[PDB]
Amino acid sequence: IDVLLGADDGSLAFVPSEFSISPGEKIVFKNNAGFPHNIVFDEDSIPSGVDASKISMSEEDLLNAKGETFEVALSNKGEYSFYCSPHQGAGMVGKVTVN
Template sequence: MKATLRAPASRASAVRPVASLKAAAQRVASVAGVSVASLALTLAAHADATVKLGADSGALEFVPKTLTIKSGETVNFVNNAGFPHNIVFDEDAIPSGVNADAISRDDYLNAPGETYSVKLTAAGEYGYYCEPHQGAGMVGKIIVQ
């Protein structure tokens, strides 16, 4: 006796996606403990350079401590350790004519993964610090070429 195999009536009925990409992303994000919204914001954010607020070891420092970028590039500061940190540019340690208040982030980044981005255009050196941890040596420098 011969078996006969029949193809489905239409390809559309034979091949259906199990779940949408959005649903798959939601499942992955929920397993990872992050919301789809924060995942999307993280993926959408563009930075030319990243500075960690707190070392992987837990030390109170910016990593890297000194960073060199080109004019017009964006620096993304990421809270790495979960301590409250901020980014305050020292008005006496930035190029003349740059408004330190406009580029600083006085509010604290409290949770790991929280970010602050700043685009720097004026060439020169930018000294900055974390206000609550400056005494512990949490200071950094960005050199804009």
């Protein structure tokens, strides 16, 4: 599943921002507009026992170039909340459910 980082109208949003996947299904987060961006899973809003570092950028890491991606497949079932650190208060957040 492809997820745009920044909308095609320049809005600081993940597109889509809420979605569901199965285990092992690729997520490709792709810089689109308004970059740099990143994608950080909130350590306190992911499934039991999951290591956020296996699946996340750090808050310091950035995708700097249009078209640059961060790819992650999730395994464990449950809800995962994530955000773009520099744009979180602007609303650049999302939630993926693995079922």
